[PDB]
Each structure stands twice: as C-alpha cells, then as structure tokens.
Design a protein around this ligand. Sequence first.
Ligand SMILES: *CCC(=O)NCc1nn(C)c2ccccc12
Length: 321
Amino acid sequence: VFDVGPRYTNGMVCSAYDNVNKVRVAIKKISPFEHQTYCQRTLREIKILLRFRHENIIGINDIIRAPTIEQMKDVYIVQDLMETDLYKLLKTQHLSNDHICYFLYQILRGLKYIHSANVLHRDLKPSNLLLNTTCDLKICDFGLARVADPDHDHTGFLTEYVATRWYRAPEIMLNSKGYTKSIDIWSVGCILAEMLSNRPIFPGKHYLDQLNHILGILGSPSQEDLNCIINLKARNYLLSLPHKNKVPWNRLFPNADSKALDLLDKMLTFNPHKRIEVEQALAHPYLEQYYDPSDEPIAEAPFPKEKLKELIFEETARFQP
Ligand SMILES: *CCC(=O)NCc1nn(C)c2ccccc12
C-alpha cells in the first residue's frame, strides 16, 4: 500500500508526478506507529523540517495522512525531487576540486542555519546529503537531531551511541553525549576527507575500533588535550595505548588542494573545544570563492506513543484540504 491521494501519480520511498504544481516530487512512506523510537524520531523530524526554511536543507512540500487519528496508519512526506545523494555519487564518481569546494560550501551554509537555530543534526553523512543534477545540495534526515545542551554533554567512557559509527567524533567514545555543535563539525570533516578520496576516512568495524581508526591518523592526543578529559576510565584508556604519530594529511591525500587540507585539519581536531566552528569554517580561505555571510542566512529564532501519534496528527494538520 503506497496511497498518496490522486494529487500524486506515476520505510518505502517513490518518485511521483504532482498534478497541482506541474513538477515531479519525492514521497517517503512512514509507517512509524508500531514502534516508539520510530514515533519520536518522526515527530522530531517533522517539527524541525517544517520550521526550517533554507536552500541547503530539504523541505517538506506536503504531508498525506488519513483525516482522523483512528484511520491514520501511515504518513507520507512529500519533498523536492533530488536525483541522488553524496553516498551514491561517491561510490562511482571522482569529484573535481571545484565540486568538492562547492559541496563543502553548501554543507556548511546549511549547517550554519541549523546551528543558528540551536539544533544539532547528529547524523551527518554522505547518504544524508541529497544532490540534484545541477549539484544543488540539501541536508536531510533530522530523526536524530537535538537541541544543543553543552552543560549536559558529559558522560562516562564507552557510553552507547545511536548515530552512524564512521562519522562519530572521538569524544563520543570517551566522555560526550553528542550534545554540542562540535559533534557536527567532526562529521563534516569526515565527509570532506571522503570527498577527497571516495573512501571513508575512519571505517571502524565496531564501537572502540572507531577510536583506533581516528588515533591511527591524528596520532596520540597531546598532554593538554588529555588534561581536558577528567573522566578517569577514558583518560587511562588513552594513556594505555602505544604512542602513535600523526599521518600528514598531504600523504593521505596527495592530490588534494592544500587549503582544503588546512580546513580538514581544523575540522578533524581531537579536542572538541579547539575544533573549528561552522562560521569560521565558511570564512576559511578554501571557501573564499563562495563566502558571503550576508547570503548565509540564520534562523529567525532558536528551536508515550499515544500522545506521540496525536502530536504527529496535530503537526501534520496544516496540509489537510
Ligand atoms: C535524508 C535521507 C533521505 O531521506 N533519503 C531518501 C531520499 N532519496 N532521494 C533521492 C530523496 C529526495 C528527496 C527527499 C528524500 C530523498
């Protein structure tokens, strides 16, 4: 059953012709009501995406559902048609330095807006960056997004985490809940590295292997950076490891633009406090062809299951005839 009224003709995803605006669209079927976690993430995404309005963030064009809570078993979310995503594109296409630069610009431009709303995406990765045939880029999937909460970021060593392993910042495995903006910049750095070589930079195979990969390239954290980790189990883990030297970025990425590698270095900084912020990244020389802060807008203001289905029903009311 993929039931999108008569408006759209010709969980599960599908393209479809929109008969009111005469353009094809994307439509995603969400059958979330059988699982609490599906419900929370569905509501969080809808609320965020309906509030956001930005060229580099996917919009919601329409939501299709039954006219009553009792009859509502699925929700269909209608979005702008985007041919592909950066995951699919990297599996077959070499990117020119110009394409890398432009994609990175648009990721950071979109992220500036998200962070300006005090929201963290928390699962940036190539498959969450949609592209069209003219290489317009739009960030999607806000199912794991949270309002930033730096005063409650601390946690113990080896705390389980939900977001995609290969794009997790080192501190997630050590002492962080992923409640600060620096979590997203690490993921962007991973994406930049992946654009440079078409391969994930830190493809860990399980939770602690991810930190092994990171330390294998950045090398051992400095004394200063360790002194910032008060958590004893995390600190002592790091002190137990043999000394590892930094792998120079220009050896890992011999064809890369030197300015790209300087910015990469700043996004993939071990210590999240020293990590570059989104606005500094936009102002970096690598992006000087595009940087224009007047044209990098910010958000106008900061942003059980039975009540969750009611909340989703209420949140989707404005699209009803
Ligand atoms: C954020 C991940 C996601 O929703 N991917 C599914 C998807 N694939 N295309 C080509 C899309 C276009 C518009 C919206 C969602 C799309």
